[PDB]
Amino acid sequence: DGVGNSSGNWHCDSTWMGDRVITTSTRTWALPTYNNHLYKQISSASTGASNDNHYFGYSTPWGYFDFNRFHCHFSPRDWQRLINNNWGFRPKRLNFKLFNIQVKEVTQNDGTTTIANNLTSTVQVFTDSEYQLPYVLGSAHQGCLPPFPADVFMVPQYGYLTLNNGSQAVGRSSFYCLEYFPSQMLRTGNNFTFSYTFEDVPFHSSYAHSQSLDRLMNPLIDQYLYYLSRTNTPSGTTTQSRLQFSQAGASDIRDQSRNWLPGPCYRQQRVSKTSADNNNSEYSWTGATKYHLNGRDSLVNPGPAMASHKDDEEKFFPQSGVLIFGKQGSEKTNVDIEKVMITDEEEIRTTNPVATEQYGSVSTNLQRGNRQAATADVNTQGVLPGMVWQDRDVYLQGPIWAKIPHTDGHFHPSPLMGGFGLKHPPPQILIKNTPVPANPSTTFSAAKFASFITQYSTGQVSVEIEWELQKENSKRWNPEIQYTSNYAKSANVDFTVDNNGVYSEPRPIGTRYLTRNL
Amino acid sequence: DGVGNSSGNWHCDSTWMGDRVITTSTRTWALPTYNNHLYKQISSASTGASNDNHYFGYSTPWGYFDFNRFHCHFSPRDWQRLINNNWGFRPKRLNFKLFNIQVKEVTQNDGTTTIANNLTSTVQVFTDSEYQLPYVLGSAHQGCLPPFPADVFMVPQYGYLTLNNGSQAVGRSSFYCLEYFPSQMLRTGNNFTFSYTFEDVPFHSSYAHSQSLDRLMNPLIDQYLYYLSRTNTPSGTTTQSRLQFSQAGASDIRDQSRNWLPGPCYRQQRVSKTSADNNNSEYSWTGATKYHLNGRDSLVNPGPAMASHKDDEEKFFPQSGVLIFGKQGSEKTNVDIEKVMITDEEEIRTTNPVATEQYGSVSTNLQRGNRQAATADVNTQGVLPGMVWQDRDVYLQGPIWAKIPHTDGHFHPSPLMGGFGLKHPPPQILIKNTPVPANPSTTFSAAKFASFITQYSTGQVSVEIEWELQKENSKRWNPEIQYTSNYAKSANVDFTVDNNGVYSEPRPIGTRYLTRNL
């Protein structure tokens, strides 16, 4: 309540209880004043950007809290306790706190920097629970809570894009003043909480499949259905056309009748981790896989969920089709392939097609016998009745949820980066330093203040998510594949700080190890 | 209550409920010390001012809060939600708050500026609910709350004028010491509220009229009254005087008998937005429309409510007759016509006369037949029995109310700038920094202190007005005229910040779009 009392305790613990698990994490943040308390419009004007790259929007003084990655809520140990023992999980209930707020004035007067507290000054915070603001949290931006609890992070700036024609605004474009919403003004000794309940969402699938969609049959027994085995006969010392039918069994395993089809496909170009096997031309944009919306084409990432590679070839991956994470200390632009860690989706190829390969072939024409039969290959395939597929995998470094756009129709809302699609997601929490004016002139003037006190605020943030689990019940005799750390000696333990204090994550960890019958 | 607790939350929201609408807005202010805590008398002496320009008055250390413009309480979106859907509105109930006060000392010692808080020092505030002080809030002065919620404003200085003869005081002039009233002394951690109820006032009229006061007739049917159509006859190969009477119908639509007359007029000079069509002389003051009070003539602005122009001519406007607003970043003196936005009253010409045109004509003399009939034109017309008129329009940038002077008589108290005339308006809120002396000498002296600590205060102000609405019920078949933003593309959305952060309002928005039967 006061200056000397503490607003809240540090709770980083997690409790695994029953089929529930409750993860909690606390961090320390610092909030600068952005834009000098000004709303500004931003655009691609004067930049000389290509038609695909134009945008129009506004940047705000506000900043927002992003907890939308998994490693915020899970340690590497709590993550393998999750994925080794469980078939699925979903979030249930959420809880959020800000406490121990401190505002601090800065003084450059001497050329030295001088910092002192300010006990009176405030920080104002509102959560958008009615979803009027543009929702930014689903784009996989930087600025989320740090992986490792000992790190202090800076709160990112809020901003949004609206409709544009070129660099210009459309006129149906909208402008939001965030000052126009009810806020709670916090001072040192005040705290902020709210709680949120997730709506019912499907469990994520942490299993793989034990058997492919091709082979669901009993190999011993034979089918009672027939297929067309032979169109012609050697009879007559020359070939003549006669239709024979055969009955499909383990001898011909590819000819059997089946109830189900593989999932859909939108085809990708194939590149190899080996530098020699790739072509020497620049195909990066031209050979890419694009969609065309309102006269400007954008790249498809990652796209619909599809297998990365076939059985044999581990080195190939789809150009735009996989999630690519950077290693600790990776620069922004034109980093070599050794500086990034590429995810591998190959557990999913039991059902889904391979990203680089075609979906199938289809008859092009009618045959007569003046004309041979011809087929063409299907690169793009939309959903058909009787198709089954798996959603993309969830990673410890990846996004938890996305907001389902509000539209007349959508099909299978699961997001393409992975995670849980939500109609009402966890709301945005926006936070800003309240402006404090520098001394005004003694005579009156109607122009607004351009002079303020330089200040910033710090504090503690605590997020608590309750997860529901689906326990593995598996009758297989032989042992599962598990996620394990290699027992060999190393100069550095993985998922650990180094002698300079830097925390690094060596490789991405998918969520599907345990196996289950298709 | 304390230093660490917060005095109040930020509420800027508005709720449209039923026929009520409740608008709320919060701003940040800064209050300098004015005059060095001294009451001073001011006058036109030594300035060399013309007889019309003399004044005598007092300036005070105090400052006051002015919320008396509409765009303080309405966003541009909430304003068109108002004017498109509603025939009328009036204010009902008001609520006011000051909170999160901060007083700050200033130090120039090094030639650098140094600012620190002062937790002990106070700020004293009183509201004048008995209306003893001269009421300044009705003159459309600068210093009102900013349009856009992100702006910090400086509280304007309080002062008033009293009776003068030339630069000298009359002796019936009065002097008010504002220290002589009960005040509430606020310190950081204290807040100030009061609530106010408007007395019953007519709804403003947000409709226009569907039909002119000339044409109220049924065009199909004929009247049973007669008028004098012809005074003479061709009969006799020459003209002789014979009175014929005719019966008025759609054939002669101007001759019918009518129950009502147009509103009154006080005539204006006509100028054109086209620079070429105006005269080259300086008529600005000499050709103006003036009233003469106590031996000094002042200009009439805007004057009684009158139409701006006739049907055809959009470029002409009355010299003093319209409200003229400045565009963002318009200087004080001698700005060109492109820097100001001129209001257009033409929706009102269904009833009221055109400002530049005459009211009518009137018979000058008696006729005999040695003497022809003569008429003269009526430039000024006072109210007659059976006259109907419309009040001047309300704008988003304009004043909400005015105080009706306390006098033996007044006619139709509606103010001439527009808005609601009130006998008891919302009271004035006056605020001042309490003086803190600099160290006195150790020996005693009876002279008052000329030395003080330099300090100023800041805080938050929140105004909440409840409005009553009159919903549109209209049976017309075809669509209304609505207020719309143009859908064409533009470099800047209107009513929006620009890339430098400056908020601008492109054009004035009147309140009357919907139409209604006269």
> Three-state SS across B102-155?
EEEEEECCCCCCEEEECCCCCEEEEEECCCCCCCCCCCCCCCECCCCCCCEEEC
CB B137 within 8 A of CB B66: yes
The SS3 call for residue A419 is: coil
Residue B252: count of CB within 10 angstroms of its CB: 12
What pairing do the DSSP bridges indicate for beta strands B86-107 and B114-117? antiparallel
Rg of chain B (C-alpha set)? 29
What pairing do the DSSP bridges indicate for beta strands B401-403 and B420-422? parallel
Q: Which residues contact A326 (CB under 8 A, 6 or more apart)?
A: A335, A339, A340, A341
- What is the rounded distance in angstroms from the CA atom of residue A413 to the CA atom of residue A391? 11
What pairing do the DSSP bridges indicate for beta strands A296-299 and B296-299? unpaired
CB B74 within 8 A of CB B469: no
- Contact A120/B102, CB-based, under 8 Å? yes
Query: b or e along B189-209 (b: 16 or more beta carbons within 10 Å of the residue's beta carbon)?
Result: bbbbebebebeebeebbbbbb
- Contact B496/A35, CB-based, under 8 Å? no
* A187 in reach of chain B (CB within 8 A): yes
Q: How far is CA A53 from the centre of its chain?
A: 22
CB B158 within 8 A of CB B143: no
Q: Which residue of A lies nearest to B459 if distances are taken between CA atoms?
A: A436
User: In this structure, which amino acid lies at residue A31?
Assistant: L
- Contact B4/A436, CB-based, under 8 Å? no
Q: Which residues contact B218 (CB under 8 A, 6 or more apart)?
A: none
Helices (H), A364-421: none
**Residue matched to tokens 């507290």:** A117
**Residue matched to tokens 């988003």:** B396
- The DSSP 8-state label assigned to residue A80 in this structure reads H
Of residues B310, B338, B314, the one with CA closest to residue B324? B338
**Residue matched to tokens 């001519």:** B313
For the record, the structure tokens of B67 come out as: 């919320």
Give bridge partners of residue A510 from the DSSP assignment: A395
CB A400 within 8 A of CB A409: no
Q: Which residues contact B479 (CB under 8 A, 6 or more apart)?
A: none
- What is the rounded distance in angstroms from the CA atom of residue A139 to the CA atom of residue A296? 20
Q: Which residues contact A217 (CB under 8 A, 6 or more apart)?
A: A223, A253, A256
In degrees and rounded to multiples of 5, residue A82 shows phi and psi of: -75, -55
Residue B409: count of CB within 10 angstroms of its CB: 4
Q: Which residues contact A135 (CB under 8 A, 6 or more apart)?
A: A403, A425, A428
- Contact A122/B100, CB-based, under 8 Å? yes
- Contact A169/B489, CB-based, under 8 Å? yes
The SS3 call for residue B182 is: coil
Nearest CB neighbour to A169, from listed B12, B148, B490: B490
| CA dihedral (B11, B183, B70, B333) positive or negative | negative
| CA dihedral (B283, B285, B291, B297) positive or negative | negative
Give the number of residues written for chain B: 518
For the record, the structure tokens of A464 come out as: 């608590």
Say how many CA atoms lie within 13 Å of A24 toward its Cβ: 14
- What is the rounded distance in angstroms from the CA atom of residue A255 to the CA atom of residue B139? 92
Nearest CB neighbour to B2, from listed A2, A122, A435: A2
B453: chain A residues, CB-CB within 8 Å: none
CB B483 within 8 A of CB B84: yes
For the record, the structure tokens of A5 come out as: 């009392």
Q: Which residues contact A53 (CB under 8 A, 6 or more apart)?
A: A44, A47
- Resolution reached, in Å? 2.8
The SS3 call for residue B346 is: helix
Give the number of residues written for chain A: 518
The SS3 call for residue A166 is: coil
Q: Which residues contact A430 (CB under 8 A, 6 or more apart)?
A: A62, A63, A64, A125, A126, A127, A128, A133, A158, A178
Interface test with A, best of B6, B80, B97, B487 (most A CBs within 10 A): B6
- What is the rounded distance in angstroms from the CA atom of residue A155 to the CA atom of residue A143? 7
Of residues A203, A212, A149, A206, the one with CA closest to residue A517? A212
Q: Which residue of A lies nearest to B486 if distances are taken between CA atoms?
A: A171
Size of interface A-B (CB pairs under 8 A): 171
- What is the rounded distance in angstroms from the CA atom of residue B15 to the CA atom of residue B9? 17
Q: Which residues contact A317 (CB under 8 A, 6 or more apart)?
A: A270, A271, A272, A273, A308, A309, A342, A344
For the record, the structure tokens of B157 come out as: 């200085």
Say how many CA atoms lie within 13 Å of A235 toward its Cβ: 9
The SS3 call for residue B365 is: coil
| CA dihedral (A110, A111, A114, A120) positive or negative | positive
Rg of chain A (C-alpha set)? 29
- What is the rounded distance in angstroms from the CA atom of residue A456 to the CA atom of residue A106? 8
Among residues 93-112 of chain A, which lie with CB inside 8 Å of chain B?
107, 109-110
- Contact A119/B4, CB-based, under 8 Å? yes
User: In this structure, which amino acid lies at residue A69?
Assistant: R
Q: Which residues contact B147 (CB under 8 A, 6 or more apart)?
A: B71, B72, B503, B505
The helix (H) or strand (E) run that includes residue A56 is strand A56-64
**Residue matched to tokens 């994470």:** A325
| CB-neighbour burial class of residue A290 (10 A; exposed 0-12, middle 13-18, buried 19+) | middle
**Residue matched to tokens 């006259």:** B387
The SS3 call for residue B227 is: strand
Secondary structure E strands in B360-512:
360-363, 375-378, 401-403, 420-422, 428-433, 455-471
Breaks (C-N over 2.5 A) in chain B follow: none
| CA dihedral (A271, A273, A277, A281) positive or negative | positive
DSSP B159-170: EEEE-EETTEE-
- What is the rounded distance in angstroms from the CA atom of residue A92 to the CA atom of residue A85? 19
Provide the experimental method for this PDB entry.
Answer: cryo-EM
| CA dihedral (A220, A223, A227, A232) positive or negative | positive
- What is the rounded distance in angstroms from the CA atom of residue A464 to the CA atom of residue A458? 20
For the record, the structure tokens of A104 come out as: 């601090």
- Contact B113/A445, CB-based, under 8 Å? no
Q: Which residue of B lies nearest to A102 if distances are taken between CA atoms?
A: B4
Say how many CA atoms lie within 13 Å of A382 toward its Cβ: 1
**Three-class SS of B269-306:** CEEECCCCCCCCCCCCCCCCCEEEECCEEEECCCCCCC
Q: How far is CA A390 from the centre of its chain?
A: 16
**Three-class SS of B7-34:** CCCECCCEECCCCEEEEEEEEEEEECCC
3-state helix, strand, coil in chain B (%, to 5): 5, 35, 60
CB A271 within 8 A of CB A324: no
User: In this structure, which amino acid lies at residue B364?
Assistant: T
For the record, the structure tokens of A510 come out as: 């998918």
Query: b or e along A187-225 (b: 16 or more beta carbons within 10 Å of the residue's beta carbon)?
Result: bbbbbbebebebeebeebbbbbbeeebeeebeeeeeeee
For the record, the structure tokens of A21 come out as: 């698990």
- Contact B146/A448, CB-based, under 8 Å? yes
Give bridge partners of residue A184 from the DSSP assignment: A125
CB A460 within 8 A of CB A11: no
Residue A435: count of CB within 10 angstroms of its CB: 20
- Contact B496/A40, CB-based, under 8 Å? no
For the record, the structure tokens of A427 come out as: 């709301």
What pairing do the DSSP bridges indicate for beta strands B123-128 and B14-15? unpaired
CB B342 within 8 A of CB B324: yes
CB A307 within 8 A of CB A346: yes
**Three-class SS of A495-512:** CCECCCCCECCCCCCECC
CB B241 within 8 A of CB B231: yes
For the record, the structure tokens of A173 come out as: 């474009």
- What is the rounded distance in angstroms from the CA atom of residue A346 to the CA atom of residue A309? 6
- What is the rounded distance in angstroms from the CA atom of residue B176 to the CA atom of residue B136? 14
In degrees and rounded to multiples of 5, residue B401 shows phi and psi of: -140, 170
CB A427 within 8 A of CB A131: yes
Query: b or e along A77-110 (b: 16 or more beta carbons within 10 Å of the residue's beta carbon)?
Result: eebbbbbbebbbbebbebebbbbbbebebebeee
- What is the rounded distance in angstroms from the CA atom of residue B105 to the CA atom of residue B118? 6
The SS3 call for residue B82 is: helix
The SS3 call for residue B337 is: helix
The SS3 call for residue B51 is: helix
